[PDB]
């Protein structure tokens, strides 16, 4: 009877976190309208068990479409990076359709992502309470917000240093992007929901709450648990905790030079590895052999397996043969790895990833391969950390911390959603009176 419409950003990681949050709300007797573009809805539907179909319904949001930018491209999943400005612009142009959806479905609440300032504005115009749900962690946000208030002060609560490669990478344009992101958090009604847990980020959540003067409510970690037959057969031939899964997420394509450093690091380590290699949608002129160093797979032999396009990440991470994760440190991948007790070898690429890698290093559940002074990935770093964490297991402290973190995360049940449910109930009761 109480209805919530959820509007994630058009990225697969965002959709996935929103879907897990929808399931938690469905278990609390809420009816959910899950709204996204058709290509995103098609990608996420196989991850919703049929038992949830009655409670969780998918609603198609239409973006402007053209032969140059057709609906199969209305996602960041595999999108050429140069189309990201168009995708953001097209999403802002879906506001009129979103208003029509809200008028037709009249949901009691809207949960929106941090990439859409228009969404709380449409909701306010229709007198629908709106709450911001952030699918990422809080460490990077608190780090980004701290210099605004304290320009001459070190970030407290952490010894993390951002490498110059990221510190270096239109000024007015960057400021506007940050203002739009912060507005989504600031505009939220009463509370901000965050995909995080206090044991990992409690101090940072509290600091963010003070800076924004807004209550921050953790609802994490939100981890989904479900070509695998072939992969499992190969993993079954390996020793326990001997293989590393290599993945850079659904939105990033490493350059040839980056792939060269990763490949040589894997080769030098002598580890078993499963590596997902992807090419942007529309690129039928590119191939695995082209993107990888000459003879690398032939040298690896039985030790190496390359998976084209997409892999069952959760199932691989849960396999007894998996001992490490070479990851770009996307938040969903970090949370999954922590839940499954797999140590992370960090190869962050951009946006929040460097911060996530630093948090993983600070927790002690993983290690970060450092970039060189010119900002390049180093094959020697990758080889050294794989050798220490998976092949020789000289870093027993990291393996122990990863197991302890997994034990903590596995111990949490539906109680983690109690604070969000109580805040939703209070907000709806207050708004009921006002309108
Ligand atoms: O919304 C307004 C925004 C656009 O500009 C705010 C700006 C004044 O700075 C915010 C912060 C740094 O406060 C410091 C400000 C001088 O005062 C610092 C302290 C004495 O309260
Ligand atoms: O081959 C792949 C690559 C990624 N994922 C899933 O894609 C999501 C990636 O989210 P993340 O936040 O880690 O990074 P992003 O793709 O947003 O950069 C995670 O749930 C991964 O488990 C997967 O299932 N198979």
User: Helix (H, G, I), strand (E, B), or coil: what is residue 230?
Assistant: helix
113-to-28, 117, 121, 389 alpha-carbon distances in Å = 21, 9, 13, 36
Show the tokens assigned to 34: 């899950």
* Domains of the chain and any CATH numbers: 3-224+412-434 (3.40.50.2000), 228-410 (3.40.50.2000)
Ligand 2 centre distance from Cα of residue 302 (Å): 26
Q: Using a 6 Å cutoff on CB, does residue 313 contact ligand 2?
A: yes
Nearest CA to ligand 1 atom 19: 149
Q: Tell me the CA–centroid distance for residue 149 and ligand 1, in Å.
A: 8
Best CA proximity match to 227, nearest among 148, 298, 316, 100: 316
Experiment type? X-ray
List of long-range contacts for 89-95, beta carbons under 8 Å, 24+ apart = 90/63, 90/64, 91/9, 91/10, 91/63, 91/115, 91/116, 92/116, 92/118, 93/63, 93/64, 94/61, 94/62, 94/63, 94/64, 95/119, 95/122
Which letter, b or e, does each residue of 119-148 get, where b requires 16 or more Cβ atoms within 10 Å of its Cβ?
bbebbeeeebbbbbbbbbbbbbbbbebbee
Distance CA 435, CA 430 (A): 9
Six token digits for residue 269: 């380590």
CB 3 within 8 Å of CB 109: yes
Cα separation, 253 vs 248, whole angstroms: 7
- Residue 150 Cα to ligand 1 middle (Å): 11
Report H helices in 132-197. 139-149, 164-168, 171-186
Residue 346: CB within 6 Å of ligand 2? no
Q: How far is the CA of 210 from the centre of ligand 1 (A)?
A: 14
Number of Cβ atoms within 10 Å of the Cβ of 426? 12
3-state SS track over 251-307: CCCCCHHHHHHHHHHHHHHCCEEEEEECCCCCCCCCCHHHHCCCCHHHHHHHHEEEE
Is the CB of 191 within 6 Å of ligand 2? no
- Tell whether ligand 1 has an atom less than 6 A from the beta carbon of residue 149: yes
- Give the CA count within 13 Å in the CB-facing half-sphere of 105: 28
Nearest CA to ligand 1 atom 15: 149
Is the distance from CB of 341 to CB of 335 less than 8 angstroms? no
Beta bridge partners of 435: none
Residues labelled as active-site residues: 14, 113
The answer to whether the CB of 137 is under 6 A from ligand 2 is no
Q: Which atom belonging to ligand 1 lies closest to the Cα atom of 149?
A: 12
Q: For 60, which DSSP code? A: E
If one residue of 149, 151, 175, 180 were mutated to test the ligand 1 pocket, choosing by the most ligand atoms within 8 A of its CB, it would be 149
Q: Whose CA is nearest to atom 24 of ligand 2?
A: 313
H or E segment and range at residue 191: strand 191-194
> 124 CA to middle of ligand 2, Å?
32
H helix or E strand, kind and range, residue 368: strand 366-368
Q: Return the ligand number nearest the Cα of 47.
A: 2
20 Cβ inside 6 Å of ligand 2: no
312-321 exposure pattern, b = at least 16 Cβ within 10 A, e = fewer: bbbbbbbbeb
User: Ligand 1, closest atom to CA 148?
Assistant: 12
Q: CA-to-CA distance for 307 and 246, rounded, in angstroms? A: 10
If we measure between CA atoms, which residue out of 124, 371, 336 comes closest to residue 261? Answer: 371
Distance from C-alpha of 429 to C-alpha of 413, rounded to nearest angstrom:
26
How far, in Å, from the CA of 212 to the mean position of ligand 1? 12
CA distance 206 to 368: 26
State the DSSP H helix or E strand holding residue 128, giving kind and residue range, or none if neither: none
């Amino acid at each position: 009877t109480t209805t919530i419409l959820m509007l994630p950003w058009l990225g697969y990681g965002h959709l996935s976190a929103f879907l897990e949050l929808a399931k938690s709300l469905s278990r609390r007797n809420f009816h959910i309208y899950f709204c996204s573009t058709s290509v995103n809805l098609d990608a996420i539907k196989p991850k919703l068990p049929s038992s949830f179909s009655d409670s969780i319904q998918f609603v198609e949001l239409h973006l402007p479409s053209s032969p140059e930018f057709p609906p199969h491209l209305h996602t960041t999943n595999g999108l050429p990076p140069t189309l990201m400005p168009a995708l953001h612009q097209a999403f802002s142009m879906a506001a009129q359709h979103f208003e029509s959806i809200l008028q037709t479905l009249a949901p009691h609440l809207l949960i929106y992502d941090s990439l859409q300032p228009w969404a709380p504005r449409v909701a306010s115009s229709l007198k629908i309470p709106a709450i911001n749900f952030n699918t990422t962690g809080v460490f990077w946000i608190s780090q980004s917000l701290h210099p605004i208030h304290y320009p001459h002060s070190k970030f407290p609560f952490s010894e993390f240093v951002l490498h110059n490669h990221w510190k270096a990478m239109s000024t007015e344009r960057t400021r506007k992007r940050g203002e739009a992101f912060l507005y989504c958090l600031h505009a939220s009604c009463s509370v901000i929901l965050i995909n995080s847990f206090r044991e990992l980020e409690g101090k940072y959540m509290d600091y963010l709450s003070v800076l924004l003067n807004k209550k921050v409510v953790p609802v994490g970690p939100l981890v989904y648990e479900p070509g695998y037959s072939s992969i499992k057969n190969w993993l079954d031939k390996k020793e326990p905790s001997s293989t590393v899964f290599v993945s850079f997420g659904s939105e990033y394509f490493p350059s040839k030079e980056e792939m060269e450093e990763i490949a040589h690091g894997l080769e030098a380590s002598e580890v078993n590895f499963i590596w997902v290699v992807r090419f942007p949608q529309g690129d039928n002129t590119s191939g695995i052999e082209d993107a990888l160093p000459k003879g690398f797979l032939e040298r690896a032999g039985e030790r190496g397996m390359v998976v084209k396009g997409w892999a069952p990440q959760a199932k691989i991470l849960k396999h007894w043969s998996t001992g490490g994760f070479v990851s770009h440190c996307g938040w969903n991948s970090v949370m999954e790895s922590m839940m499954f007790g797999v140590p992370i070898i960090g190869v962050p690429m951009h946006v929040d990833q460097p911060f996530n890698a630093g948090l993983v290093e600070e927790a002690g559940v993983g290690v970060e391969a450092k970039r060189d002074p010119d900002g390049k990935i180093q094959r020697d770093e990758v080889a050294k950390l794989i050798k220490e964490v998976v092949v020789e297991k000289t870093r027993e402290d990291v393996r122990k911390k990863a197991r302890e973190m997994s034990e903590i995360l596995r111990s949490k049940g539906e109680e983690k959603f109690d604070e969000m449910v109580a805040e939703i109930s209070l907000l709806l009761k207050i708004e009921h009176h006002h309108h």
